[PDB]
A and B are shown apart, each in its own frame.
With several copies, the nearest count.
Chain A
Amino acid sequence: VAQLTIGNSTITTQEAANIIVGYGEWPSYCSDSDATAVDKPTRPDVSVNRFYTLDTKLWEKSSKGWYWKFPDVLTETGVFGQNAQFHYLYRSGFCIHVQCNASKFHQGALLVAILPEYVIGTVAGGTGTEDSHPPYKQTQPGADGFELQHPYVLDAGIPISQLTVCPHQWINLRTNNCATIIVPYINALPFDSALNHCNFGLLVVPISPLDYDQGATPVIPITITLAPMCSEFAGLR
């Protein structure tokens, strides 16, 4: 046991298990050239660099899986929510940390992954005749995430059977629980909007269904804690 403390926050997470650094790159600030050359972007090191602990989601024998959209997820709660709202341009890396409190008498496996530009696609009506672009609920599901309706096709006709081709980490209950992923800023632009375009999505699906002999707490809590690595903003409003 060893509790990391970076900010007015103090998560009592494991000493130092294995963390998957995304696409093999630590999120950093910027050389000296961007979508702003006579506009030196202030780099929030203040309260924009602490631990955020999203409202734990409950895993049932039936959860289809969940997903969050960055940077949206936090533009809500937080002083990082203060920045993302009062600023025009934005660039920031991350570091998610998904924990699972369960007993040795439970069992399951969660695939946790980061998928850049995660574009959803609802039923398209019901059978497939309605160009209805998903609600403002599926495009930016705040800090409480959103559930997958068709886990198999990740809600975008792509097979989850191949999701591991993204920065991912497994969470097999009989072997661990906490899993970590350091995401670097991935975009086709140095500085992009932090309110309309969501640089990516964090998925967390039960590949091996949760289960327990009858009599154990049936819902295992999944606690997602994240830390904004190298925030950057330009021009306030």
Chain B
Amino acid sequence: GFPTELKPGTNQFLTTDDGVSAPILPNFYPTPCIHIPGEVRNLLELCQV
């Protein structure tokens, strides 16, 4: 075993925090996305309409 000390925030759930966690379906290959006309990437695009 490699030495570790736990820092505060252990076992904590922050709604904003975004680390990760395993896929419920490992071998699942989400049907590829094709090309959909007019994608939006930043709401600010809209604010100029």
Contacts and interface: CB of A to CB of B under 8 A. Distances in A.
User: Per the CB under 8 Å rule, do A and B touch in the complex?
Assistant: yes
Which label, helix, strand, loop or mixed, suits the secondary structure of the A interface? loop
Interface residues of A, number: 13
Interface string B17-40: 000000000000000001011100
A22 interface: yes
Which label, helix, strand, loop or mixed, suits the secondary structure of the B interface? loop
Contacts of B34: 189-190
B49 A25 contact: no
A48 B38 CA distance: 26
A191 to B, nearest CB: 11
Interface of B: 34, 36-38, 46, 49
Given A22-B37, A25-B37, 16 more contacts: A23-B37, A23-B38, A24-B37, A24-B38, A25-B38, A164-B49, A165-B46, A165-B49, A184-B37, A186-B36, A186-B37, A186-B38, A187-B36, A188-B36, A189-B34, A190-B34
